[PDB]
């Protein structure tokens, strides 16, 4: 019941927390994606 609370307030806060984490990592991998596409020019 740790990852699955009883109170709805605890459930909402948990989903908010996870959403913040998932978005944070997503905004990192997609951020410096341009530097990767520039490395591609070296090949061709």
């Amino acid at each position: 019941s740790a990852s699955n609370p009883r109170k709805f307030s605890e459930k909402i806060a948990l989903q908010k927390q996870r959403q913040a984490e998932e978005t944070a990592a997503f905004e990192e991998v997609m951020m410096d994606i341009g530097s990767t596409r520039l490395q591609a020019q070296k090949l061709r």
Binding site: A25, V29, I33, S35, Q39, A40
Partner: protein, 53 residues
Amino acid sequence: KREVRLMKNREAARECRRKKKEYVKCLENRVAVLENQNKTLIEELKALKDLYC
């Protein structure tokens, strides 16, 4: 007429709460699945960047 209307709605309210319960469990289940797929795609895309950099 009252007894009939009450019994019909009382029995039609139970199935309504059941469907909502299943719908909520569906969302929670779908959140968990999409969470795992998200984590995997991020981890692989991060590996695909390392592969060419």
